[PDB]
Ligand binder design. Sequence first.
Ligand SMILES: [K+]
Ligand code: NI
Length: 405
Amino acid sequence: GPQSEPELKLESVVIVSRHGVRAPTKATQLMQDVTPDAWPTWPVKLGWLTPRGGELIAYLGHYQRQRLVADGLLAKKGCPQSGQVAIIADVDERTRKTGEAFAAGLAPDCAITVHTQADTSSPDPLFNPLKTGVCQLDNANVTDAILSRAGGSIADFTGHRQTAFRELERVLNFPQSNLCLKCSLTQALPSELKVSADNVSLTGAVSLASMLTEIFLLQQAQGMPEPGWGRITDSHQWNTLLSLHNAQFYLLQRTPEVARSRATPLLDLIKTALTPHPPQKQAYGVTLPTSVLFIAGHDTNLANLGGALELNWTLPGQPDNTPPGGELVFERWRRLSDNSQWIQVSLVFQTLQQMRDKTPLSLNTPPGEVKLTLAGCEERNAQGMCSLAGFTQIVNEARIPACSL
Ligand SMILES: [K+]
Ligand code: NI
């Protein structure tokens, strides 16, 4: 019957995904000392993807197949052919397994290759060129930029967030902890900004809180019976706790003086996947451009891209602004009225309840989705997309040539 008159046609999609639910990457003495209670144990090694984590990613893969079929970009049946779908992952187990999980959902029994760099025992600079020394941060500029975004000092930062720290202390039962028996997390563990040529980090309570509140969220998404020892009982509490995780990434990963450098290889890969040109084999042996590119990375990659491109978002129903399986989705659309080219960016994610309930996703039960705007874009169409030329200029301005591969 008479369907909606197509105004735009989808040409290409690039999905930059955080890996799915993983076991905590550390088990430190300080984590033991800040609570009298025992941390729940995990079914996989430190930092590895859990089976449930993979099942949640495959749900997003299944959903993406349904909606890309609806958009006309992929075929309803059969496998995608001749590199129509490509997958690139970081070398870590949790990212490679995320790529395998997404392929399993998008195109089951089609053994789509999960590409990595040749040496999987060494870091891939695409996901952080600082880590292999491709380039370095500017120490004075990064320090000033982060401290300013903190409110002028890390003390000012923690001074404005005492409500959230007190909520974490309650969940920890911190007053009955060994650290307390000697009480306030921020004063017991003074936080300072450490800036080196290759990394930025915060010490003390700020970084501890970001980690621990992430762990509670992973416990919830994993389906563990009582996250935070049963002391997290409503959504306001979840939002208050994860604000500490979000706040650290705002400072350390969204600040442009860090984000532009760390995101430059990803920016280049995204722009080459989205740019119309004769298809040509390039990075990882992958032929670009193509229909669908899935990149399996990390929390910091989403934040770095958001900071470098001036994309801002909060995720309704998902307290972690960079959640497991969260996807930054870049799409190239052709406007049929004049066959002009446009870029849309959105953030696709499972709500915390969808993770808690292990909700299979479909057109009828979609993940959450936030439409984004490139703040620097001066040429937008009626749907808020940026012109291909405008997007290209933004990326060329944001990228840092010394950080490119
Ligand atoms: K302030
Ligand atoms: Ni996150």
